[PDB]
Design a protein around this ligand. Structure first.
Ligand SMILES: [Ca+2]
Ligand SMILES: [Ca+2]
Ligand SMILES: [Mg+2]
Ligand SMILES: [Mg+2]
Lengths: 548, 548
């Protein structure tokens, strides 16, 4: 009955989604002139990447002003228009709150490098906004996230004469949360956008706020306690608004970012731990990884909801699989050197799947049939490729391809003038892969996606239903139930590339009619001991309901 | 043992395939260059639409010189280099012998309409090359093939001042096969091209040579005599050349055109009867009508091979179905009255199936698993569309779409300057559908097609075996065996738009394992009464073997 539970999220980047000024970069008037596409696609809630003033050393995750609107994208007036227009269509909009760090260009860190005591004598209140060390020897058992760039997590600052902490890029100094004033600053940054009517934030790099000696400085308890404070605020001051976390960690630690009915934290976390096992299972044709990891997720509080996703603006991340699993995921999905960046693969959905529609359709149904609310990477619903010529994780962020005209419909600037080049190779280029062509293709991947979402939308068990795996006895075939209110769903997906047989244990269901959700065609009723034989085509999926 | 029984045929018009010189019209130089393409797609034999001198009032089926090359297409020297280059890759090439009629522009008719005796009393030995009535009353109990356009099968010749007979356009006066010089002329024309090394003929519209009073003037015994004489000449003089027949009739009548081992006619006949029911079975989600019509075919002579196809240069033809079958086909496949011509539907394959890969793939697997030798219609391997802006069945004959170059790569002439305008609409134009994009696209329909052709080669039972339908007990699901040397193929294919269960009668095959043709994936061993419960996804096809 929470709104975000039955929602369907869509992730996009105002700078890559739609130009409006012909400038080569997208803007909020560009995004605003396309809200009819998102609603009519079947999106409920837009998640927009960071839109704040930034030098874009990390595409806006180095925020320079938490209450502004990056010029490229237009004005705070523009932003308040877009919020009115999406709200009129019944779309929620959530932003990206970058709590762990700011840009080195931020007024705060510009002030901070002035040292602790000021020229006139007085305290320098911004010095302890950030995290300083004299020689940089604290925190030594901590992994470095941005592997192909950073070599320490401490950087020397010329003016300050001291060292400063950054879990990410050197130009992204970490904020010091033992500073009470810093917590009050973010609360103030949140309140500003939540007073303009934003429906919540997806919160970034949450596990890295506090760092302590003798720990990996991930998932610390005092970090969790900061986060409950946000939840505490937003619950009191904005009943309704949504906190959604990106906690890339192992299933045992991720669930804690929900934390407790009495001490609530996030409303939604991403189900990072299933998403690599999905790709893994396609190559091993062995879905067992999916169950093992799903079984390491303990129950989440009543308010809690999983955000299911396949790709996103970051790389496909192998930071939380075993050493062998990572070796395997590079071997199978990263044959080239260029394809890998810091423990991960910078490739979009369709290249990863050899542009196989069956496989794209397979993983999308699993994404819609796994428990939670699903998020869609922009462009992936028409089958966009990538540009591995672009540096660091940007090749998956090429601009939305809207038609076959200039620069894909994204701009009227020539492709070489756009912020990222719009893709125009023979396979995934906008002349072949574009939204106009797919609004008129009765069988386009666009129309299949939207049909799929109508199909999920008609069956509340997909959002709120429980989940129960059933044994099948063929590891290529994955099957499970979703029961909720009236109906019980039965979802059986073939993860292998040719016809597979399988013996489903439907013991608890003897005597039910299993029927197709698309048009109610009947299969045999379950009888005897409830071992239900099935054959599946290559990469098939059956979405079924069990009548009784 | 005969080469044509193992061949895969590719139908193509030179005038629309590849242009060599930028004059806007495809030619033999152009085609010669694309022979590596057909070779690699999996084609063995080229069937070339009429290349002869013609007014092109019926796309060159109105011939004005049997022993020459239409300027538009190149020289006779071009032709010889083409055959050298096509043979050098081990391809066969069959032409199109138009026996029943010539153009009104043909010298024989221009001589014929001079009348019976010349103004100098001497007698016109060219007048009864054709079929002359003084008032146009004979053969009144016959039908008008080109119903949409010709009002009568007699037309008044203003010059000779009497009626001549045509089954087709008034521009296509019928030849008079009761005059022995005509049969001589026709054999002589066949010998011209067979002397040049051409490998055979598709003989056009064979049911209509002889017209006889009081009859339906089709399938007369006298035409089969004429046709037997042709076969005799081939047999005796050029052994080993193919004769194929456009015999669009009812099944009991089509087999007559192979005519006995004692005195044979055609090596091959197109299986017109199964084609309409494939389309019909797919909208009716019921495959009865297929089994039905296949039984109505008698077994054919040893030499004979059936020739399956889905589409061709002509319309999808509905003359040989019941009127309620026609009422259904029109209502399901022609939602616009323009879409229907001459008791048929003039659309390409992909528009017909709504550009739906699973449906395009399903009918293509059936083409390849049904008994006989399959014909691909040019461009259908890439999912080409139709251009109804072009009159009379030319909407399916648009230029080949090779790349997204200026005219789709067909010509350097720009689109408005070609013979037919290359398709450029959003869904089917060369910007989106073309050979080059599909050569690089791992999952392209072109590639799926080369692999399936590849897999049909791995199993000689596909070209040479028998056909035996299995029970299934579900009209949607259609199953059958093909057996030939050691082996037994099992071809199960679903014709419904959603999952369907079945119960295959495989009692002849208890205790043996069905194994996947693609990946050698074994399925459970057949037990018990051999009744094999299965389930199929939407528009699926299971290609299997049943081992020793
Ligand atoms: Ca931190
Ligand atoms: Ca005739
Ligand atoms: Mg702009
Ligand atoms: Mg030419």
């Amino acid at each position: 009955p929470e709104w975000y539970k039955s929602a369907v999220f869509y992730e996009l980047s105002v700078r890559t989604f739609q130009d409006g000024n012909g400038d080569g970069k997208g803007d909020f008037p560009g995004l605003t002139s396309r809200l009819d596409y998102l609603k009519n696609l079947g999106v409920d809630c837009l998640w927009l990447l960071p839109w704040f003033p930034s030098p874009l050393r990390d595409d806006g995750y180095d925020v320079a002003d938490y209450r502004g609107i990056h010029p490229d994208l237009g004005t705070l007036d523009d932003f308040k228009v877009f919020l009115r227009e999406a709200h009129a269509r019944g779309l929620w909009v959530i932003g990206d709150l970058v709590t762990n760090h700011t840009s080195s260009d931020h007024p705060w860190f510009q002030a901070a490098r002035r040292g602790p005591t000021l020229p006139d004598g007085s305290p320098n209140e911004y010095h302890d906004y950030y995290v300083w060390s004299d020689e940089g020897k604290e925190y030594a058992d901590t992994r470095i996230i941005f592997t192909d760039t950073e070599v320490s997590n401490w950087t020397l600052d010329e003016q300050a004469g001291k060292y400063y902490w950054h879990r990410f890029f050197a130009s992204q100094p970490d904020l010091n949360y033992d500073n009470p004033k810093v917590v009050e600053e973010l609360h103030g940054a949140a309140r500003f956008w939540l007073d303009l009517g934003l429906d919540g934030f997806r919160v970034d790099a949450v596990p890295y706020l506090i760092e302590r000696e003798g720990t990996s400085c991930e998932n610390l308890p005092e970090t969790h306690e900061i986060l409950k404070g946000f939840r505490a605020m937003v619950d009191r001051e904005y009943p309704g608004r949504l906190l959604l976390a990106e906690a890339h960690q192992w299933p045992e630690e991720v669930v804690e970012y929900f934390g407790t009915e009495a001490e609530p934290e996030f409303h939604m976390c991403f189900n990072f731990p299933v998403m690599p096992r999905l790709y893994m299972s396609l190559k091993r044709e062995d879905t067992s990884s999916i169950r093992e990891i799903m079984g390491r997720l303990p129950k989440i509080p009543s308010f809690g909801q999983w955000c299911i996703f396949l790709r996103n603006h970051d790389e496909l991340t192998l930071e939380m699989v075993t050493d062998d699993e990572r070796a395997f995921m590079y071997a199978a999905y990263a044959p080239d050197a260029r394809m890998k960046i810091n423990v991960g693969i910078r490739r979009r959905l369709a290249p990863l799947l050899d542009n196989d529609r069956r496989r794209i359709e397979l993983l999308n149904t699993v994404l819609l049939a796994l428990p939670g609310s699903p998020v869609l990477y922009y462009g992936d619903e028409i089958g966009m490729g990538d540009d591995l010529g672009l540096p660091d994780r940007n090749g998956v962020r090429t601009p939305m391809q809207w038609n076959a005209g200039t620069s894909g419909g994204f701009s009227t600037a020539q492709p070489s003038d756009c912020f990222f080049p719009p893709i125009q190779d023979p396979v995934y280029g906008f002349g072949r892969v574009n939204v106009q062509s797919q609004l008129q293709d009765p069988s386009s991947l666009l129309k299949w996606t939207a049909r799929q979402l109508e199909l999920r939308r008609a069956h509340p068990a997909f959002a709120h239903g429980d989940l129960t795996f059933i044994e099948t006895g063929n590891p290529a075939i994955l099957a499970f139930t979703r029961q909720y209110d009236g109906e019980t769903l039965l979802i059986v997906s073939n993860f292998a590339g040719n016809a597979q047989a399988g013996l489903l244990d439907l013991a608890p269901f003897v005597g039910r009619a299993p029927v197709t959700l698309s048009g109610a065609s009947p299969l045999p009723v379950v009888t005897g001991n409830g071992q239900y034989p099935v054959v599946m085509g290559k990469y098939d999926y059956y979405w079924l309901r069990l009548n009784s």
